[PDB]
Symmetry: C2
Subunit: 447 residues, 2 copies
Amino acid sequence: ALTQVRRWDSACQKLPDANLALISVAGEYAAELANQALDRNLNVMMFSDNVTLEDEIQLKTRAREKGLLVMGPDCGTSMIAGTPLAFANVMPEGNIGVIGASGTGIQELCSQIALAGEGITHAIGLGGRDLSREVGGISALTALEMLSADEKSEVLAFVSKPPAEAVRLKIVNAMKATGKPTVALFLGYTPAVARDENVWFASSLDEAARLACLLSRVTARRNAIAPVSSGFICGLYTGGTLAAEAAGLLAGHLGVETHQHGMMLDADSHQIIDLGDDFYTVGRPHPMIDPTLRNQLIADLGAKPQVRVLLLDVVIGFGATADPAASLVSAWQKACAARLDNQPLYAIATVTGTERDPQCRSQQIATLEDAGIAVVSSLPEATLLAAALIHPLSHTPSLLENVAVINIGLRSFALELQSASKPVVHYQWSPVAGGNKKLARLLERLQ
Amino acid sequence: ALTQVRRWDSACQKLPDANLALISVAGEYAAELANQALDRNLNVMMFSDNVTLEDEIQLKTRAREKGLLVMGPDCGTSMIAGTPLAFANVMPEGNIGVIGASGTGIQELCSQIALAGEGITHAIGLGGRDLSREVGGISALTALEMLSADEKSEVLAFVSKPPAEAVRLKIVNAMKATGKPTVALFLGYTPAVARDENVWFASSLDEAARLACLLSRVTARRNAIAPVSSGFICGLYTGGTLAAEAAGLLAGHLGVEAHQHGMMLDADSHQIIDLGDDFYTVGRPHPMIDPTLRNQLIADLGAKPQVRVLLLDVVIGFGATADPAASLVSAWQKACAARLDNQPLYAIATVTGTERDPQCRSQQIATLEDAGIAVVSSLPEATLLAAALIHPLHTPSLLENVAVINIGLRSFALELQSASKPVVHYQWSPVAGGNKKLARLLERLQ
C-alpha cells in the first residue's frame, strides 16, 4: 500500500529518514520543489524537463555547499543502492560504479555490462546539461567523489556527450584523482590516446562496457589476491607470436618502449621470454612439444624470490604435450614450496586451443584453476593483471548506503519503487488549486 | 594401421588422390623434396626449418606458375578441409577462412574464433618469411585467391607481422579484390584507418577475432535472408542516445558525414529518427512509455516499398511499456502483410535491459525473433547488418579434400591417421640404407 501525502512535513514524518526527493512535476515548478527539498537537506533527482540553466546552476552550486547531490534536470535514469529511479533496470550486483549525463546511455551501458557478465554498485545520472560549458560538471565532480569513496565501487565507468575542452579536462583530472580504474565514454568521439594513467577511453557503448568488465575482472582478482610485496614479472612463453604480443601489451601498461635471443621485453627487471627462440633450443626439443625446459625454469623460480608474477601460455592441440597443465602445476608448486610467505609467486595463464583438442581446453583450464593458477581468456587481461599484481595495495556516502525517497511528481515512479519494495512516500502535488477542476481537466487533456 | 612407404612411387600409387606433401625432413633437404613434390604437381607444406630464402623464392614462384601452393619453410600450423597439419587444433566448421604467416598467431586467432562460437573453413599457414621484402607475399596472394574463390569462406581473417610498405599495399589490395569482409591483423601495428572498404584493420589477436566473428554473424545472417532488391534503411528509435550512436555508426558504414527535429541521419534516403525528440512528443507520452506513434509509423511502412530495412531499439525496465515486443510484432506484421514479395521489409532490433526487468529480456527477444525480427546484441552489429541487407546479390580442389604424403617426422602422419584423414608416411633419410656407421652418426647427432 503506497503511502501517499500532500504536504512536505506530512511526507517527512511518514518517512523521518528520507534521503532523496525524486521530482517529476511540470518543469516550471521543478526548481521550486528542488529548493524546498534542499531546505530539508535532501538529495534531489529531477527527472523533470523544462528547467532553466540558471535554476540548474543555482541548485547544483547550493547542493555543493550543503554537501548534497542534485541530479540535474532532465535526468531520466539512476539506480542507487539497488533503488530504481525513473527509467531504471534491474541490475546484477557488481563492482562497477556508473556515472552518466545521459538517459539510455546509462541504460545501454549497464545492459551491456550485465550482458558481459558483470554488475554495478550504482548508476548515477547527472542531468543532460551537467557537462555543459555553463554548468561546469558540478554534479559529475560530486558523483566522482562519492564513488571514489565507495569501496564497493572498484571500477568506474562514465558516459556523456563529449564535453568542451576546459570541462573534459576538469573531468579527467577528477577521474585520475579517484585512483580507480575508470572508463570514460565520450559518445561518438575517437579519443586522443586509448589510456591515460587510470583512465581508459572509449567511443561506443558496448566498447565501453567490454572495457569496464575487463577492468572489473582484473581489479576483482587483484583485490582477492591482495598482493603485499612488490617484485618482478617473468613471462615464460612457448609460442613466439604470443610472447611478442604479451611483450607489446605489457610494455604499454608500463609506459615502456628489435628483440634479440628471445628476450621479448626486459624493463625494470620485468621479462617476457620466448623459450621457442634458438637461444633456448640448442640440444633440446621445442618447448611446445617438450615441457622439460620451461617446467624446470618454473620450478627454479623458487630460488628467485624477487619474481612475483609468472606469465604463461598453454598451447594444446596436435603436436603438443599430452597433458601440459598437470606438469605445469607440479612445477610451479615446487617453486611456491621454496618461497617464503612474504615472497609468493602468482601464476597467470592463457590457454590456446579447443574443447575437442586431445588435451581438452576445459579440462586443462580446470587443472590450472584448481591448483590456484589464474586463467584468463586473453593476453590483454593476462598482462594487465600481471602489471596490477606487481604493485602492492596501498567512509561510504550515506546516500549510497541507503535511499529513502519522497516522490513528488508522477505516481508511477512511486509505484515502481513500491515493486522494488524500497522506502517511498508519494507526495501528490499539483500546480492547480484543489477545487479548480476546470483547469485540472484542461492541463491533463493538453498533456 | 599407418601405411608406410619408401619411394614416391609407392606413396602416389597408395594415395592416388594425394594433394599435398607435408615435409619435416632436415632443412638442407626440404627444398629438394619440395621440388620433387612439385614435379608431381603436389601442393607443399614445409614445416621443416633451415631452408634458404633463395630456395623459398624458387619453390613459391614455381608453385605459383603451376597453380599450386607452397606453404613457406618454417610453417608450423595449418588446417585445410578439416585436416590438421603439424601444430594444429581441432576446429569447429564455420564461415571464416584464415590465412597466416604465423604459427601460434593462427592458433590463438582460431582458438578465439572457436570460443566466440564461430568456426573456420581453413587456416592456411604461409611460412614466417612469406611477406618479407625478398619473397613478396607469393603464397599470401595465392591463399587469398583460393579463399576468395571458396564460397564457404564468407569472411576472411589474415594475420602476420607488419609487412614493409610495398608488400603491405599489394596485400591489402588483394584483400580488397576478394570483395569479402576481411580482417587484416598486422601484429603490433597501429592502423591509422580502422576500415578501408571491405578491409578491417586490427592490432591484437583478440580484437581480430572479435571483428572476424562480428563480420561472421552479419554475413551469415545476410546470406540467409538472401536479399534480392535494394532499398532504404529506416531507423525508428525511442531512446535518444541510442539513435545518435546508431546514426553515427551507420554513417560510417555508409561512408558519409552526418541533428534537427530528431533526424539523426538522413542521407541517400536512409533515415535514423529519434522519436523521443520534442518534435514527435507534442501532445503525447514519450515513445518509451507509449508505443502508439512508432507502431503507427512502422505499420505505415507497408505502403512504402523502397524501405527495405527497419532498425529498432526496445528499452525495457521499470518505466517502459509492459510488453513492447507484443505491439511491435503486431505493427510489424501489418506492414509486411501489405508488401509484395519482391519488396520485403527486414526488421532488426537491439534490446536494452536485463533478464530481471519486468518485461524480461529473453522473453521479449523470443517474441521478437518468433515473428522474424532479427535481434542482435549491439548497435554496431545492427547497423552493420542494416547496411549489409541493402545491396544485395569454382572451389580449389585442395580446399575440397586433402590427401597427404607425409615425409619428415612420423608423428605428423600418426596425427593425421588418428583423425581418419587420408595419409601415407614416406619413411625417408639423408643416409642410404647400406651405410650403418653414417646412420649411427646421424642418429646420435640428432
